[PDB]
Design a protein around this ligand. Structure first.
Ligand SMILES: CN(Cc1cnc2nc(N)nc(N)c2n1)c1ccc(C(=O)N[C@@H](CCC(=O)O)C(=O)O)cc1
Ligand SMILES: CN(Cc1cnc2nc(N)nc(N)c2n1)c1ccc(C(=O)N[C@@H](CCC(=O)O)C(=O)O)cc1
Ligand SMILES: [Ca+2]
Ligand SMILES: [Cl-]
Ligand SMILES: [Cl-]
Lengths: 159, 159
């Protein structure tokens, strides 16, 4: 199954020119708890920002341009991309926008982090039909000694 | 010699309790490199925000209350705090506000990271009359993929 996992600011902003202006170690811990021992499919921009292969997950970069790290697989198409990961129960799309638009249609579940942060964006999370999705998990939290904005984690399943 | 190390947003705005609205691994690398192998003094809020002893550093918490962890030294006064090290070449004060305010008059060096982030706050780094300080090192940096904003590194010596 294909799942999408994203941190969204107010208005569905998922990326900037630069790093987002939030420090959410809890958002990372949720990110990891849900991506571990799973194949993660990302684009190049995001790969350039993670800094390295993610530990304990099969890194897959979806891109028309190639062959830079030895430590991740390099796929050129979604179709290929899907296979490169395999016969797995669930594949994780970790963005950015472009990969998001393309995997959506196939998406059966969404893992979202709603961050209360107003940012002028560059990329956005495609527009999903809130009618098409069902919320099966929700959990709100306030900013604290380590998290700079309040956030809410949610899981949607395609209706 | 006592030094203060602070990251400040526009208007000398510093953190009060919740994490600051930014992601600057460059600022943390600078912090490390400048504090490693030295004693660091801080308040109860900063400690909670760090949340573990800084490695390679002698951790001193200047609170007025109850020593909660044995892996750290718990003073109660400026006096107690200094002594607590004896004779080292440099003592670093890593904040918050109140600590800045009580060590400034004994401080002869400042390592400041100036961040182009308009952020809102009650607290501010204490006011230092530049006729008592010399800009000795300065170096700007553009925001990037790993760092949300622009920052300027700066060391000033008390004259
Ligand atoms: C820039 N970024 C891409 C990124 C960031 N946050 C997101 N957060 C959510 N919810 N979802 C996204 N898809 C996600 N993507 C990163 C940056 C670092 C980490 C990483 O360093 N995470 C550690 C866990 C956290 C820490 O231990 O360093 C990892 O094991 O996954 C992953 C993605
Ligand atoms: C929230 N907090 C207070 C803190 C944050 N940055 C500041 N930045 C400056 N320049 N100075 C301050 N006094 C300051 N102190 C922290 C947070 C984490 C780290 C800690 O994780 N530092 C690692 C180095 C950084 C990388 O380890 O993640 C350490 O070894 O210093 C310390 C400071
Ligand atoms: Ca429901
Ligand atoms: Cl990307
Ligand atoms: Cl403090």
């Amino acid at each position: 199954m294909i799942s999408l996992i994203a941190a969204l600011a107010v208005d569905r902003v998922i990326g900037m020119e630069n790093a987002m202006p939030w420090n959410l170690p809890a958002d990372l811990a949720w990110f990891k708890r849900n991506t571990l021992d799973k194949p993660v499919i990302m684009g190049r921009h995001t790969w350039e920002s993670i800094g390295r292969p993610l530990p304990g997950r099969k890194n897959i970069i979806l891109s028309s341009q190639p062959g830079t790290d030895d430590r991740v697989t390099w796929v050129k198409s979604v179709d290929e991309a899907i296979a490169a990961c395999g016969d797995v129960p669930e594949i994780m799309v970790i963005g950015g926008g472009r990969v998001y638009e393309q995997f959506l249609p196939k998406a059966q579940k969404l893992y979202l982090t709603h961050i209360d942060a107003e940012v002028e964006g560059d990329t956005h999370f495609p527009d999903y039909e809130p009618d098409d999705w069902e919320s099966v998990f929700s959990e709100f939290h306030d900013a604290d000694a380590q998290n700079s904005h309040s956030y809410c984690f949610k899981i949607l399943e395609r209706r």
